[PDB]
Amino acid sequence: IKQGIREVILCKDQDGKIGLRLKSIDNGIFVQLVQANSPASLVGLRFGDQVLQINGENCAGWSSDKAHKVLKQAFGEKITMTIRDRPFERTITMHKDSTGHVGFIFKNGKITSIVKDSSAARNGLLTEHNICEINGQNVIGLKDSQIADILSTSGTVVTITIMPAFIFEHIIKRMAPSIMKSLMDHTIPEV
């Protein structure tokens, strides 16, 4: 989680699209969905991200409907956005043991238990937290088996980005779980 506000310049695709859905939370506007292969993913917008401004207009108190509206009525040429990076999330780094375990049980993305003497324990991982990303990759809507596969196919060092479930549940709300599985950008970023 990069601590600060950064600026991104977007450009609508051939189809007029930017690949973004935004959700109103606590009188801000947050990224609910980033579509793979979109101007939004290229410029590196992330699920969870706060949008403070669009085109220099403040977003405070905007509905989702309204933020969606504004994006459609902007010249594709240059959409400036000012972004606070994943303010609702934290990242934990952990080490697998000899037996290739970090030390927790989870279900539907939600960590539900932590195991004694594990790295999960030593690093103070919490239950009631939804997994957002592993080792830099968005894992939301993937099935547990897939999430579990990512964890085995990772090095010894595992980095998890987590979000309190109450907040996660407020964000994905009004999002059908297939759009997540299919459309939500699950790719390693591109250099």
Side-chain angles (χ1 to χ4, degrees), residues 158-170:
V158 190
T159 266
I160 316 179
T161 306
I162 72 183
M163 176 182 304
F166 190 69
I167 304 175
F168 177 103
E169 296 306 320
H170 187 191

Side-chain angles (χ1 to χ4, degrees), residues 113-185:
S113 141
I114 317 291
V115 178
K116 299 180 189 171
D117 281 74
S118 79
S119 189
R122 282 188 315 278
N123 294 275
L125 185 65
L126 296 180
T127 54
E128 202 64 14
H129 277 78
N130 265 284
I131 308 182
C132 282
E133 297 178 348
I134 307 162
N135 271 344
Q137 173 190 355
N138 184 316
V139 289
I140 290 173
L142 296 203
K143 302 184 292 73
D144 287 318
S145 41
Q146 318 197 231
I147 299 159
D149 284 308
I150 313 216
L151 277 166
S152 36
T153 76
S154 170
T156 39
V157 178
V158 190
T159 266
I160 316 179
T161 306
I162 72 183
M163 176 182 304
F166 190 69
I167 304 175
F168 177 103
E169 296 306 320
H170 187 191
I171 281 178
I172 69 170
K173 185 197 179 177
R174 311 304 181 168
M175 219 218 313
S178 47
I179 305 164
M180 300 205 243
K181 222 175 92 71
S182 282
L183 279 150
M184 173 84 71
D185 178 32

